[PDB]
């Protein structure tokens, strides 16, 4: 397997988004994963509607809009719905709204999704190298997480009990410190232009490999 991967270099990652005061991290992680598959399958990079997920993948999917949700059930909604709209046609408002999905603006579909084995960083590495960006949950309930600025993030208080959905878009090592390249949804001002490099192969640090999943078109 390659020693380093960065899907941004292959044009498979859209601009970093900003969720604001809405807990839509799960929606952003899910569309981020599908946006990469869309680029790989059609040759075009389009940001997909996180709002579509927030407004439409609700109770039936165990999701609570701005109060939280799951990437896996978001993918199921896209499968059941037979599509998800473009972000351009269905903009993010950081608020719970009525469902306004319209197939006229469908920008992608999802036929299935895959869940990786609990805590296996080696399997996660393979998937990121061979399949593409992977949605994961991390333990971000530590003030050091939002205050992260650069380098490889390591928080001794972290645990494997996850609560924040993000997207792994690569991996590598910074002078010997292995890491996962993670795209967040806290805007361009967070971390390294919207990304955080999290410790890799350090005992499933922050639970990054606890619940990984990726969709396929
Ligand atoms: C992402 O932004 C959120 C935080 S929800 C709490 C909150 C914080 C700040 C403002 C408003 C609300 N997290 C989630 O959406 C997580 C994502 C996730 C996915 C997979 C594994 C771990 C975590 N999901 C949840 O918090 N919930 C899922 C649905 O029931 C409600 C809780």
Curated annotation (Swiss-Prot):
The entry's active site is 25, 164, 184
Chief place of localization: other
Asked if Protease is a keyword of the record, the answer is: yes
Source organism's superkingdom?
Eukaryota
Tagged with keyword Protease: yes
What general EC class does the enzyme of this chain belong to?
A: hydrolase
Task: Give the E.C. number(s).
Answer: 3.4.22.27
Q: Name one GO biological process term.
A: extracellular matrix disassembly
According to its UniProt entry, what is the function of this protein?
A: Thiol protease. Key protease responsible for the removal of the invariant chain from MHC class II molecules and MHC class II antigen presentation. The bond-specificity of this proteinase is in part similar to the specificities of cathepsin L.
Q: Which family does the entry's similarity section mention?
A: Belongs to the peptidase C1 family.
- What does the annotation say about its assembly with partners? Monomer.
Protein name from the UniProt record: Cathepsin S
Q: Which gene encodes it?
A: CTSS
């Amino acid at each position: 397997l390659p020693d380093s991967v960065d899907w941004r270099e292959k044009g498979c990652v859209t601009e970093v988004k900003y969720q604001g005061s809405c807990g839509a991290c799960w929606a952003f992680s899910a569309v981020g994963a599908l946006e990469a598959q869309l680029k790989l399958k059609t040759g075009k990079l389009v940001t997909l509607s996180a709002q579509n997920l927030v407004d439409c993948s609700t109770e039936k999917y165990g999701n609570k809009g701005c109060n939280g949700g799951f990437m896996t059930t978001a993918f199921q909604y896209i499968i059941d719905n037979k599509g998800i709209d473009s972000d351009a046609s269905y903009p993010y408002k950081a608020m719970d709204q009525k469902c306004q999905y319209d197939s006229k603006y469908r920008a992608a579909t999802c036929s299935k999704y895959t869940e990786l084995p609990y805590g296996r960083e080696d399997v996660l590495k393979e998937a990121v190298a061979n399949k593409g960006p992977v949605s994961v949950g991390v333990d971000a309930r530590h003030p050091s997480f939002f205050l992260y600025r650069s380098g490889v993030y390591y928080e001794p208080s972290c645990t494997q009990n996850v609560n924040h959905g993000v997207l792994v878009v690569g991996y590598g090592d910074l002078n010997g410190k292995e890491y996962w390249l993670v795209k967040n949804s806290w805007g361009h001002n967070f971390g390294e232009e919207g990304y955080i490099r999290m410790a890799r192969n350090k005992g499933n640090h922050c639970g990054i490999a606890s619940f990984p999943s990726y969709p396929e078109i």
